[PDB]
Amino acid sequence: LVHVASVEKGRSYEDFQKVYNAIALKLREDDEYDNYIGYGPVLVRLAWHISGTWDKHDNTGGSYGGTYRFKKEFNDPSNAGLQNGFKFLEPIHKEFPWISSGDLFSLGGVTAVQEMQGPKIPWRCGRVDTPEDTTPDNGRLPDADKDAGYVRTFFQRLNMNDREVVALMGAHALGKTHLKNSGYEGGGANNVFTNEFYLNLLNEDWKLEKNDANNEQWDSKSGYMMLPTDYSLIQDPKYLSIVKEYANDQDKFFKDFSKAFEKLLENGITFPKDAPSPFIFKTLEEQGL
Ligand code: HEM
Ligand SMILES: COP(=O)(NC(=O)c1ccccc1)OC
């Protein structure tokens, strides 16, 4: 099972920079969503959920096929709340109908990270929409009520190592939980990309409590929360070492996150030797827009 990248016919960097700019401008103007958090965090989640169905064993799932557009995946209970990101991107897709679904969903995650003052994330085009029958079954995305052992084992399926896992989890500095989506409540409601996740993990006084949906979560007096799977990163001695590294080195965290996130969005795709180099898009700020 091979998924070959195929560049949308006759399109070049400037075409994709246009799509980036439309997403970025809409992020700026549709700023009231989720109590003024804006759509940055949910688009990052969306890009992760469409990628995180990949299975290294048989090469099924992942971002290539854009299969989130089909009802089985769209209605996965693990995807509750992501409809909001879909609705955000829908008018963009009408404006640029030439872009594939997988390219649009993954580009939306890249745009959101960079527009939230995160690291540059190189991105490659050429995902190709595949038929409804290529949609993975529900149940490939991870549960939040588990320990470090489960996290490590789960992420092996996506071919991610300990450092890649800890770096990717720093995205939990963004956005918040919503009781209606996941049965978890609270969070910091942040829309600037920083290494605060690790600082919070190490500096807050956490207390395990049951919440209003009867799930266990870690709460701090300051009002922050951590999922059981977040808190597992300071329970396991290998993850804890890396948490301390990122808490103490913002630049290292940005660079590692960029690498891991691009790998996540590219898993399962074979790029021809003569495919274009990855693109690095300019932010609105860098264009003076
Ligand atoms: C063990 C793996 C993970 C688990 C169990 C997990 C679980 C969750 C849960 C339960 C929520 C709250 C959903 C809601 O109530 O709206 C959430 C939010 C979020 N997750 Fe994760 N997550 C994981 C890994 C990741 C990764 C790898 C990323 C991206 C690189 C990511 C990005 C986000 C973002 C940005 C939000 C906030 C979304 C919003 O504010 O709407 N997560 N996650
Ligand atoms: C940085 O805010 P947080 O309170 N964690 C979150 O806001 C958060 C965000 C998304 C998913 C889970 C927690 O830090 C302990």
Side-chain angles (χ1 to χ4, degrees), residues 33-34 41-42 44-45 48-49 80 142-144 151 155 168-169 171-172 174-179 181-182 184 227 229 257 261 264:
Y33 170 77
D34 223 359
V42 72
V44 174
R45 199 184 159 224
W48 141 240
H49 276 215
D143 297 328
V151 173
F155 273 102
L168 281 171
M169 213 74 73
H172 278 179
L174 304 167
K176 64 193 239 209
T177 58
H178 310 83
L179 199 91
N181 291 346
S182 61
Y184 293 94
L227 303 163
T229 46
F257 178 88
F261 194 60
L264 179 75

PDB file of all heavy atoms in Angstrom, residues 33-34 41-42 44-45 48-49 80 142-144 151 155 168-169 171-172 174-179 181-182 184 227 229 257 261 264, ligand 1:
ATOM      1  N   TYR A  33     -14.545  33.198  18.288  1.00  0.00           N
ATOM      2  CA  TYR A  33     -14.828  31.781  18.530  1.00  0.00           C
ATOM      3  C   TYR A  33     -14.228  31.299  19.857  1.00  0.00           C
ATOM      4  O   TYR A  33     -13.100  31.664  20.173  1.00  0.00           O
ATOM      5  CB  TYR A  33     -14.255  30.960  17.348  1.00  0.00           C
ATOM      6  CG  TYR A  33     -14.250  29.488  17.575  1.00  0.00           C
ATOM      7  CD1 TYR A  33     -15.424  28.747  17.452  1.00  0.00           C
ATOM      8  CD2 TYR A  33     -13.064  28.818  17.944  1.00  0.00           C
ATOM      9  CE1 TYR A  33     -15.447  27.384  17.672  1.00  0.00           C
ATOM     10  CE2 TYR A  33     -13.066  27.451  18.169  1.00  0.00           C
ATOM     11  CZ  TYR A  33     -14.251  26.739  18.038  1.00  0.00           C
ATOM     12  OH  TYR A  33     -14.275  25.394  18.266  1.00  0.00           O
ATOM     13  N   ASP A  34     -14.984  30.498  20.613  1.00  0.00           N
ATOM     14  CA  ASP A  34     -14.530  29.904  21.891  1.00  0.00           C
ATOM     15  C   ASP A  34     -14.051  30.962  22.889  1.00  0.00           C
ATOM     16  O   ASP A  34     -12.925  30.909  23.394  1.00  0.00           O
ATOM     17  CB  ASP A  34     -13.416  28.854  21.635  1.00  0.00           C
ATOM     18  CG  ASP A  34     -13.583  27.588  22.469  1.00  0.00           C
ATOM     19  OD1 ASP A  34     -14.542  27.482  23.281  1.00  0.00           O
ATOM     20  OD2 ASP A  34     -12.747  26.671  22.319  1.00  0.00           O
ATOM     21  N   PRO A  41      -6.154  26.928  17.910  1.00  0.00           N
ATOM     22  CA  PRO A  41      -6.030  25.632  18.582  1.00  0.00           C
ATOM     23  C   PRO A  41      -6.861  24.497  17.942  1.00  0.00           C
ATOM     24  O   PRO A  41      -6.340  23.363  17.723  1.00  0.00           O
ATOM     25  CB  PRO A  41      -6.456  25.954  20.031  1.00  0.00           C
ATOM     26  CG  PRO A  41      -6.034  27.385  20.201  1.00  0.00           C
ATOM     27  CD  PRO A  41      -6.337  28.036  18.860  1.00  0.00           C
ATOM     28  N   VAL A  42      -8.121  24.760  17.560  1.00  0.00           N
ATOM     29  CA  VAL A  42      -8.919  23.664  17.009  1.00  0.00           C
ATOM     30  C   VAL A  42      -8.367  23.161  15.643  1.00  0.00           C
ATOM     31  O   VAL A  42      -8.439  21.979  15.337  1.00  0.00           O
ATOM     32  CB  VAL A  42     -10.453  23.970  16.977  1.00  0.00           C
ATOM     33  CG1 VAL A  42     -10.803  24.986  15.909  1.00  0.00           C
ATOM     34  CG2 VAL A  42     -11.268  22.633  16.835  1.00  0.00           C
ATOM     35  N   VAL A  44      -5.165  23.133  14.880  1.00  0.00           N
ATOM     36  CA  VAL A  44      -4.034  22.279  15.230  1.00  0.00           C
ATOM     37  C   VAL A  44      -4.555  20.881  15.603  1.00  0.00           C
ATOM     38  O   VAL A  44      -4.012  19.863  15.138  1.00  0.00           O
ATOM     39  CB  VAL A  44      -3.110  22.906  16.348  1.00  0.00           C
ATOM     40  CG1 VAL A  44      -1.996  21.877  16.806  1.00  0.00           C
ATOM     41  CG2 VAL A  44      -2.521  24.246  15.858  1.00  0.00           C
ATOM     42  N   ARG A  45      -5.599  20.821  16.421  1.00  0.00           N
ATOM     43  CA  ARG A  45      -6.178  19.537  16.799  1.00  0.00           C
ATOM     44  C   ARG A  45      -6.630  18.764  15.563  1.00  0.00           C
ATOM     45  O   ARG A  45      -6.346  17.583  15.422  1.00  0.00           O
ATOM     46  CB  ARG A  45      -7.348  19.726  17.767  1.00  0.00           C
ATOM     47  CG  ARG A  45      -7.702  18.479  18.560  1.00  0.00           C
ATOM     48  CD  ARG A  45      -8.928  18.700  19.431  1.00  0.00           C
ATOM     49  NE  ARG A  45      -9.566  17.443  19.810  1.00  0.00           N
ATOM     50  CZ  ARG A  45     -10.878  17.232  19.781  1.00  0.00           C
ATOM     51  NH1 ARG A  45     -11.702  18.195  19.391  1.00  0.00           N
ATOM     52  NH2 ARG A  45     -11.367  16.058  20.139  1.00  0.00           N
ATOM     53  N   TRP A  48      -3.806  17.233  13.648  1.00  0.00           N
ATOM     54  CA  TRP A  48      -3.344  16.052  14.391  1.00  0.00           C
ATOM     55  C   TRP A  48      -4.280  14.848  14.255  1.00  0.00           C
ATOM     56  O   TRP A  48      -3.840  13.719  13.961  1.00  0.00           O
ATOM     57  CB  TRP A  48      -3.038  16.486  15.833  1.00  0.00           C
ATOM     58  CG  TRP A  48      -3.399  15.559  16.958  1.00  0.00           C
ATOM     59  CD1 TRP A  48      -4.277  15.856  18.015  1.00  0.00           C
ATOM     60  CD2 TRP A  48      -2.880  14.256  17.232  1.00  0.00           C
ATOM     61  NE1 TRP A  48      -4.344  14.796  18.872  1.00  0.00           N
ATOM     62  CE2 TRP A  48      -3.503  13.800  18.425  1.00  0.00           C
ATOM     63  CE3 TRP A  48      -1.934  13.410  16.581  1.00  0.00           C
ATOM     64  CZ2 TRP A  48      -3.216  12.546  18.998  1.00  0.00           C
ATOM     65  CZ3 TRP A  48      -1.688  12.129  17.125  1.00  0.00           C
ATOM     66  CH2 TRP A  48      -2.337  11.713  18.323  1.00  0.00           C
ATOM     67  N   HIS A  49      -5.583  15.083  14.387  1.00  0.00           N
ATOM     68  CA  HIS A  49      -6.538  13.961  14.315  1.00  0.00           C
ATOM     69  C   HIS A  49      -6.653  13.337  12.945  1.00  0.00           C
ATOM     70  O   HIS A  49      -6.854  12.131  12.848  1.00  0.00           O
ATOM     71  CB  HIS A  49      -7.909  14.381  14.848  1.00  0.00           C
ATOM     72  CG  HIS A  49      -7.982  14.261  16.343  1.00  0.00           C
ATOM     73  ND1 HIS A  49      -9.122  13.893  17.020  1.00  0.00           N
ATOM     74  CD2 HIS A  49      -7.004  14.352  17.280  1.00  0.00           C
ATOM     75  CE1 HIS A  49      -8.865  13.823  18.319  1.00  0.00           C
ATOM     76  NE2 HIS A  49      -7.582  14.077  18.500  1.00  0.00           N
ATOM     77  N   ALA A  80     -15.111  14.665  18.164  1.00  0.00           N
ATOM     78  CA  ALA A  80     -16.132  15.606  18.630  1.00  0.00           C
ATOM     79  C   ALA A  80     -15.575  17.003  18.819  1.00  0.00           C
ATOM     80  O   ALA A  80     -14.590  17.192  19.558  1.00  0.00           O
ATOM     81  CB  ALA A  80     -16.779  15.102  19.981  1.00  0.00           C
ATOM     82  N   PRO A 142      -6.038   8.289  20.400  1.00  0.00           N
ATOM     83  CA  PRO A 142      -5.766   7.787  21.765  1.00  0.00           C
ATOM     84  C   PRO A 142      -6.773   8.228  22.800  1.00  0.00           C
ATOM     85  O   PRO A 142      -7.434   9.248  22.617  1.00  0.00           O
ATOM     86  CB  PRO A 142      -4.365   8.373  22.093  1.00  0.00           C
ATOM     87  CG  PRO A 142      -4.346   9.680  21.321  1.00  0.00           C
ATOM     88  CD  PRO A 142      -5.141   9.410  20.024  1.00  0.00           C
ATOM     89  N   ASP A 143      -6.858   7.461  23.895  1.00  0.00           N
ATOM     90  CA  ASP A 143      -7.686   7.825  25.045  1.00  0.00           C
ATOM     91  C   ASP A 143      -6.850   8.684  25.978  1.00  0.00           C
ATOM     92  O   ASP A 143      -5.639   8.506  26.064  1.00  0.00           O
ATOM     93  CB  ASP A 143      -8.083   6.575  25.852  1.00  0.00           C
ATOM     94  CG  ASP A 143      -8.970   5.572  25.057  1.00  0.00           C
ATOM     95  OD1 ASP A 143      -9.752   6.000  24.203  1.00  0.00           O
ATOM     96  OD2 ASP A 143      -8.860   4.353  25.325  1.00  0.00           O
ATOM     97  N   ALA A 144      -7.520   9.546  26.731  1.00  0.00           N
ATOM     98  CA  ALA A 144      -6.885  10.480  27.637  1.00  0.00           C
ATOM     99  C   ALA A 144      -6.735   9.956  29.075  1.00  0.00           C
ATOM    100  O   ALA A 144      -6.078  10.558  29.880  1.00  0.00           O
ATOM    101  CB  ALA A 144      -7.677  11.806  27.604  1.00  0.00           C
ATOM    102  N   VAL A 151       0.730   5.644  26.549  1.00  0.00           N
ATOM    103  CA  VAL A 151       1.174   6.711  25.630  1.00  0.00           C
ATOM    104  C   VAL A 151       2.349   6.231  24.776  1.00  0.00           C
ATOM    105  O   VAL A 151       2.362   6.415  23.557  1.00  0.00           O
ATOM    106  CB  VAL A 151       1.575   8.005  26.412  1.00  0.00           C
ATOM    107  CG1 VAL A 151       2.204   9.073  25.470  1.00  0.00           C
ATOM    108  CG2 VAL A 151       0.295   8.612  27.113  1.00  0.00           C
ATOM    109  N   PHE A 155       1.991   5.627  20.633  1.00  0.00           N
ATOM    110  CA  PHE A 155       2.792   6.393  19.672  1.00  0.00           C
ATOM    111  C   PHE A 155       3.799   5.607  18.868  1.00  0.00           C
ATOM    112  O   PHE A 155       4.193   6.062  17.794  1.00  0.00           O
ATOM    113  CB  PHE A 155       3.470   7.578  20.374  1.00  0.00           C
ATOM    114  CG  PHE A 155       2.576   8.793  20.416  1.00  0.00           C
ATOM    115  CD1 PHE A 155       1.897   9.134  21.584  1.00  0.00           C
ATOM    116  CD2 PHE A 155       2.370   9.529  19.264  1.00  0.00           C
ATOM    117  CE1 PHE A 155       1.077  10.260  21.621  1.00  0.00           C
ATOM    118  CE2 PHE A 155       1.562  10.681  19.280  1.00  0.00           C
ATOM    119  CZ  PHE A 155       0.900  11.033  20.439  1.00  0.00           C
ATOM    120  N   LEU A 168       5.575  16.784  20.770  1.00  0.00           N
ATOM    121  CA  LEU A 168       4.249  16.975  20.199  1.00  0.00           C
ATOM    122  C   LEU A 168       3.229  17.326  21.286  1.00  0.00           C
ATOM    123  O   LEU A 168       2.309  18.113  21.058  1.00  0.00           O
ATOM    124  CB  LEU A 168       3.785  15.674  19.495  1.00  0.00           C
ATOM    125  CG  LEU A 168       4.352  15.387  18.109  1.00  0.00           C
ATOM    126  CD1 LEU A 168       3.935  13.957  17.735  1.00  0.00           C
ATOM    127  CD2 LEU A 168       3.834  16.446  17.107  1.00  0.00           C
ATOM    128  N   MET A 169       3.366  16.720  22.476  1.00  0.00           N
ATOM    129  CA  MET A 169       2.446  17.035  23.548  1.00  0.00           C
ATOM    130  C   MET A 169       2.492  18.505  24.006  1.00  0.00           C
ATOM    131  O   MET A 169       1.547  18.951  24.628  1.00  0.00           O
ATOM    132  CB  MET A 169       2.662  16.079  24.767  1.00  0.00           C
ATOM    133  CG  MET A 169       1.340  15.788  25.506  1.00  0.00           C
ATOM    134  SD  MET A 169       0.387  14.602  24.420  1.00  0.00           S
ATOM    135  CE  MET A 169       1.335  13.091  24.678  1.00  0.00           C
ATOM    136  N   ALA A 171       1.838  20.935  22.421  1.00  0.00           N
ATOM    137  CA  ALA A 171       0.683  21.634  21.804  1.00  0.00           C
ATOM    138  C   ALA A 171      -0.479  21.755  22.800  1.00  0.00           C
ATOM    139  O   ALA A 171      -1.432  22.490  22.525  1.00  0.00           O
ATOM    140  CB  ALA A 171       0.183  20.836  20.573  1.00  0.00           C
ATOM    141  N   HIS A 172      -0.423  21.008  23.920  1.00  0.00           N
ATOM    142  CA  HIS A 172      -1.488  21.105  24.953  1.00  0.00           C
ATOM    143  C   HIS A 172      -1.385  22.380  25.790  1.00  0.00           C
ATOM    144  O   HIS A 172      -2.209  22.600  26.671  1.00  0.00           O
ATOM    145  CB  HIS A 172      -1.562  19.833  25.845  1.00  0.00           C
ATOM    146  CG  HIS A 172      -2.342  18.742  25.193  1.00  0.00           C
ATOM    147  ND1 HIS A 172      -2.535  17.505  25.754  1.00  0.00           N
ATOM    148  CD2 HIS A 172      -3.037  18.742  24.034  1.00  0.00           C
ATOM    149  CE1 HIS A 172      -3.297  16.777  24.958  1.00  0.00           C
ATOM    150  NE2 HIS A 172      -3.613  17.503  23.904  1.00  0.00           N
ATOM    151  N   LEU A 174      -1.996  24.936  24.135  1.00  0.00           N
ATOM    152  CA  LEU A 174      -2.987  25.679  23.336  1.00  0.00           C
ATOM    153  C   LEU A 174      -4.438  25.322  23.665  1.00  0.00           C
ATOM    154  O   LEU A 174      -4.758  24.166  23.926  1.00  0.00           O
ATOM    155  CB  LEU A 174      -2.771  25.421  21.822  1.00  0.00           C
ATOM    156  CG  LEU A 174      -1.366  25.740  21.316  1.00  0.00           C
ATOM    157  CD1 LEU A 174      -1.181  25.129  19.892  1.00  0.00           C
ATOM    158  CD2 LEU A 174      -1.101  27.255  21.357  1.00  0.00           C
ATOM    159  N   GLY A 175      -5.337  26.289  23.556  1.00  0.00           N
ATOM    160  CA  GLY A 175      -6.788  25.985  23.586  1.00  0.00           C
ATOM    161  C   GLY A 175      -7.281  25.518  24.963  1.00  0.00           C
ATOM    162  O   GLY A 175      -6.739  25.899  26.024  1.00  0.00           O
ATOM    163  N   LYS A 176      -8.305  24.677  24.969  1.00  0.00           N
ATOM    164  CA  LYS A 176      -8.853  24.195  26.229  1.00  0.00           C
ATOM    165  C   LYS A 176      -9.701  22.954  26.027  1.00  0.00           C
ATOM    166  O   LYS A 176     -10.006  22.584  24.900  1.00  0.00           O
ATOM    167  CB  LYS A 176      -9.696  25.287  26.882  1.00  0.00           C
ATOM    168  CG  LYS A 176     -10.926  25.668  26.077  1.00  0.00           C
ATOM    169  CD  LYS A 176     -11.549  26.955  26.588  1.00  0.00           C
ATOM    170  CE  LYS A 176     -12.983  26.734  27.034  1.00  0.00           C
ATOM    171  NZ  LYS A 176     -13.808  27.963  26.879  1.00  0.00           N
ATOM    172  N   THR A 177     -10.088  22.315  27.126  1.00  0.00           N
ATOM    173  CA  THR A 177     -11.000  21.187  27.035  1.00  0.00           C
ATOM    174  C   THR A 177     -12.429  21.745  27.082  1.00  0.00           C
ATOM    175  O   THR A 177     -12.671  22.890  27.476  1.00  0.00           O
ATOM    176  CB  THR A 177     -10.736  20.104  28.123  1.00  0.00           C
ATOM    177  OG1 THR A 177     -10.844  20.706  29.401  1.00  0.00           O
ATOM    178  CG2 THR A 177      -9.317  19.597  28.042  1.00  0.00           C
ATOM    179  N   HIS A 178     -13.361  20.960  26.584  1.00  0.00           N
ATOM    180  CA  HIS A 178     -14.766  21.355  26.591  1.00  0.00           C
ATOM    181  C   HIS A 178     -15.483  20.129  27.062  1.00  0.00           C
ATOM    182  O   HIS A 178     -15.352  19.056  26.474  1.00  0.00           O
ATOM    183  CB  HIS A 178     -15.242  21.742  25.192  1.00  0.00           C
ATOM    184  CG  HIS A 178     -14.352  22.718  24.502  1.00  0.00           C
ATOM    185  ND1 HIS A 178     -13.215  22.332  23.813  1.00  0.00           N
ATOM    186  CD2 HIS A 178     -14.425  24.067  24.387  1.00  0.00           C
ATOM    187  CE1 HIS A 178     -12.624  23.406  23.317  1.00  0.00           C
ATOM    188  NE2 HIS A 178     -13.342  24.472  23.646  1.00  0.00           N
ATOM    189  N   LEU A 179     -16.240  20.270  28.145  1.00  0.00           N
ATOM    190  CA  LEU A 179     -16.929  19.122  28.693  1.00  0.00           C
ATOM    191  C   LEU A 179     -17.761  18.344  27.676  1.00  0.00           C
ATOM    192  O   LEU A 179     -17.705  17.119  27.655  1.00  0.00           O
ATOM    193  CB  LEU A 179     -17.739  19.512  29.946  1.00  0.00           C
ATOM    194  CG  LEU A 179     -18.068  18.257  30.776  1.00  0.00           C
ATOM    195  CD1 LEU A 179     -16.988  17.979  31.824  1.00  0.00           C
ATOM    196  CD2 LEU A 179     -19.439  18.388  31.431  1.00  0.00           C
ATOM    197  N   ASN A 181     -17.315  17.989  24.469  1.00  0.00           N
ATOM    198  CA  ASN A 181     -16.510  17.258  23.497  1.00  0.00           C
ATOM    199  C   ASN A 181     -15.874  16.014  24.065  1.00  0.00           C
ATOM    200  O   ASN A 181     -15.827  14.971  23.414  1.00  0.00           O
ATOM    201  CB  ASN A 181     -15.374  18.159  22.954  1.00  0.00           C
ATOM    202  CG  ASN A 181     -15.871  19.293  22.075  1.00  0.00           C
ATOM    203  OD1 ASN A 181     -17.022  19.299  21.640  1.00  0.00           O
ATOM    204  ND2 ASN A 181     -14.994  20.258  21.799  1.00  0.00           N
ATOM    205  N   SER A 182     -15.289  16.115  25.250  1.00  0.00           N
ATOM    206  CA  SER A 182     -14.406  15.045  25.703  1.00  0.00           C
ATOM    207  C   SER A 182     -14.621  14.543  27.124  1.00  0.00           C
ATOM    208  O   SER A 182     -14.029  13.548  27.522  1.00  0.00           O
ATOM    209  CB  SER A 182     -12.950  15.480  25.547  1.00  0.00           C
ATOM    210  OG  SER A 182     -12.684  16.625  26.329  1.00  0.00           O
ATOM    211  N   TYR A 184     -13.859  16.337  29.679  1.00  0.00           N
ATOM    212  CA  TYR A 184     -12.833  17.015  30.463  1.00  0.00           C
ATOM    213  C   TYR A 184     -13.164  18.481  30.405  1.00  0.00           C
ATOM    214  O   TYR A 184     -13.626  19.002  29.369  1.00  0.00           O
ATOM    215  CB  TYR A 184     -11.393  16.762  29.932  1.00  0.00           C
ATOM    216  CG  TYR A 184     -11.001  15.343  30.124  1.00  0.00           C
ATOM    217  CD1 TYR A 184     -11.174  14.429  29.116  1.00  0.00           C
ATOM    218  CD2 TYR A 184     -10.561  14.863  31.351  1.00  0.00           C
ATOM    219  CE1 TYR A 184     -10.878  13.098  29.295  1.00  0.00           C
ATOM    220  CE2 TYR A 184     -10.247  13.535  31.541  1.00  0.00           C
ATOM    221  CZ  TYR A 184     -10.407  12.642  30.524  1.00  0.00           C
ATOM    222  OH  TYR A 184     -10.125  11.319  30.722  1.00  0.00           O
ATOM    223  N   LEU A 227      -4.620  16.406  31.568  1.00  0.00           N
ATOM    224  CA  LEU A 227      -5.148  15.064  31.365  1.00  0.00           C
ATOM    225  C   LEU A 227      -4.281  14.043  32.063  1.00  0.00           C
ATOM    226  O   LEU A 227      -3.116  14.289  32.271  1.00  0.00           O
ATOM    227  CB  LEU A 227      -5.172  14.709  29.864  1.00  0.00           C
ATOM    228  CG  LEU A 227      -5.987  15.711  29.013  1.00  0.00           C
ATOM    229  CD1 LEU A 227      -5.649  15.574  27.516  1.00  0.00           C
ATOM    230  CD2 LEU A 227      -7.531  15.551  29.243  1.00  0.00           C
ATOM    231  N   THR A 229      -3.015  11.492  30.665  1.00  0.00           N
ATOM    232  CA  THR A 229      -1.934  11.241  29.734  1.00  0.00           C
ATOM    233  C   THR A 229      -0.887  12.394  29.757  1.00  0.00           C
ATOM    234  O   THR A 229       0.279  12.119  29.477  1.00  0.00           O
ATOM    235  CB  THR A 229      -2.465  10.996  28.298  1.00  0.00           C
ATOM    236  OG1 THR A 229      -3.445  12.003  27.970  1.00  0.00           O
ATOM    237  CG2 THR A 229      -3.104   9.578  28.183  1.00  0.00           C
ATOM    238  N   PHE A 257       9.645  20.438  18.043  1.00  0.00           N
ATOM    239  CA  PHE A 257       8.235  20.363  17.719  1.00  0.00           C
ATOM    240  C   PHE A 257       8.053  20.478  16.219  1.00  0.00           C
ATOM    241  O   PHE A 257       7.203  19.758  15.631  1.00  0.00           O
ATOM    242  CB  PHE A 257       7.415  21.487  18.410  1.00  0.00           C
ATOM    243  CG  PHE A 257       5.963  21.451  18.031  1.00  0.00           C
ATOM    244  CD1 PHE A 257       5.056  20.657  18.767  1.00  0.00           C
ATOM    245  CD2 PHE A 257       5.518  22.171  16.894  1.00  0.00           C
ATOM    246  CE1 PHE A 257       3.690  20.614  18.385  1.00  0.00           C
ATOM    247  CE2 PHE A 257       4.173  22.131  16.509  1.00  0.00           C
ATOM    248  CZ  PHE A 257       3.256  21.369  17.244  1.00  0.00           C
ATOM    249  N   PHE A 261       6.152  17.584  14.195  1.00  0.00           N
ATOM    250  CA  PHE A 261       4.848  17.907  13.614  1.00  0.00           C
ATOM    251  C   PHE A 261       4.874  17.702  12.097  1.00  0.00           C
ATOM    252  O   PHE A 261       3.924  17.155  11.520  1.00  0.00           O
ATOM    253  CB  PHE A 261       4.469  19.358  14.009  1.00  0.00           C
ATOM    254  CG  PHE A 261       3.005  19.694  13.763  1.00  0.00           C
ATOM    255  CD1 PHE A 261       2.001  18.979  14.393  1.00  0.00           C
ATOM    256  CD2 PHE A 261       2.670  20.791  12.945  1.00  0.00           C
ATOM    257  CE1 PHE A 261       0.668  19.314  14.176  1.00  0.00           C
ATOM    258  CE2 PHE A 261       1.336  21.130  12.732  1.00  0.00           C
ATOM    259  CZ  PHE A 261       0.340  20.377  13.353  1.00  0.00           C
ATOM    260  N   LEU A 264       4.688  13.981  11.593  1.00  0.00           N
ATOM    261  CA  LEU A 264       3.303  13.559  11.818  1.00  0.00           C
ATOM    262  C   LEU A 264       2.381  13.799  10.587  1.00  0.00           C
ATOM    263  O   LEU A 264       1.597  12.905  10.187  1.00  0.00           O
ATOM    264  CB  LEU A 264       2.741  14.328  13.022  1.00  0.00           C
ATOM    265  CG  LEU A 264       1.292  14.054  13.419  1.00  0.00           C
ATOM    266  CD1 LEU A 264       1.187  12.676  14.134  1.00  0.00           C
ATOM    267  CD2 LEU A 264       0.754  15.164  14.348  1.00  0.00           C
TER     268      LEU A 264
HETATM  269  C1  HEM B   1      -1.940  11.063  24.205  1.00  0.00           C
HETATM  270  C2  HEM B   1      -2.259  11.827  23.146  1.00  0.00           C
HETATM  271  C3  HEM B   1      -3.363  12.917  23.251  1.00  0.00           C
HETATM  272  C4  HEM B   1      -4.517  12.867  23.904  1.00  0.00           C
HETATM  273  C5  HEM B   1      -5.095  11.688  24.733  1.00  0.00           C
HETATM  274  C6  HEM B   1      -5.207  14.108  23.680  1.00  0.00           C
HETATM  275  C7  HEM B   1      -6.444  14.406  24.231  1.00  0.00           C
HETATM  276  C8  HEM B   1      -7.048  15.627  24.154  1.00  0.00           C
HETATM  277  C9  HEM B   1      -8.313  16.036  24.760  1.00  0.00           C
HETATM  278  C10 HEM B   1      -9.216  15.111  25.622  1.00  0.00           C
HETATM  279  C11 HEM B   1      -8.515  17.333  24.435  1.00  0.00           C
HETATM  280  C12 HEM B   1      -9.739  18.249  24.780  1.00  0.00           C
HETATM  281  C13 HEM B   1     -10.746  18.106  23.593  1.00  0.00           C
HETATM  282  C14 HEM B   1     -11.913  19.040  23.870  1.00  0.00           C
HETATM  283  O1  HEM B   1     -12.500  18.838  24.958  1.00  0.00           O
HETATM  284  O2  HEM B   1     -12.244  19.982  23.078  1.00  0.00           O
HETATM  285  C15 HEM B   1      -7.420  17.770  23.600  1.00  0.00           C
HETATM  286  C16 HEM B   1      -7.245  19.051  23.110  1.00  0.00           C
HETATM  287  C17 HEM B   1      -6.256  19.507  22.267  1.00  0.00           C
HETATM  288  N1  HEM B   1      -5.234  18.740  21.717  1.00  0.00           N
HETATM  289 FE1  HEM B   1      -4.785  16.824  22.383  1.00  0.00          FE
HETATM  290  N2  HEM B   1      -4.412  14.922  22.897  1.00  0.00           N
HETATM  291  C18 HEM B   1      -3.277  14.197  22.582  1.00  0.00           C
HETATM  292  C19 HEM B   1      -2.211  14.624  21.795  1.00  0.00           C
HETATM  293  C20 HEM B   1      -2.205  15.803  21.062  1.00  0.00           C
HETATM  294  C21 HEM B   1      -1.267  16.184  20.041  1.00  0.00           C
HETATM  295  C22 HEM B   1      -0.114  15.281  19.577  1.00  0.00           C
HETATM  296  C23 HEM B   1      -1.614  17.413  19.587  1.00  0.00           C
HETATM  297  C24 HEM B   1      -1.014  18.258  18.468  1.00  0.00           C
HETATM  298  C25 HEM B   1       0.289  18.220  18.115  1.00  0.00           C
HETATM  299  C26 HEM B   1      -2.776  17.832  20.293  1.00  0.00           C
HETATM  300  C27 HEM B   1      -3.369  19.073  20.152  1.00  0.00           C
HETATM  301  C28 HEM B   1      -4.457  19.496  20.884  1.00  0.00           C
HETATM  302  C29 HEM B   1      -4.951  20.852  20.880  1.00  0.00           C
HETATM  303  C30 HEM B   1      -4.346  22.053  20.105  1.00  0.00           C
HETATM  304  C31 HEM B   1      -6.134  20.845  21.787  1.00  0.00           C
HETATM  305  C32 HEM B   1      -7.002  22.088  22.117  1.00  0.00           C
HETATM  306  C33 HEM B   1      -8.115  22.134  21.031  1.00  0.00           C
HETATM  307  C34 HEM B   1      -9.172  23.205  21.325  1.00  0.00           C
HETATM  308  O3  HEM B   1      -8.860  24.129  22.115  1.00  0.00           O
HETATM  309  O4  HEM B   1     -10.288  23.108  20.700  1.00  0.00           O
HETATM  310  N3  HEM B   1      -3.088  16.870  21.206  1.00  0.00           N
HETATM  311  N4  HEM B   1      -6.547  16.702  23.488  1.00  0.00           N
END
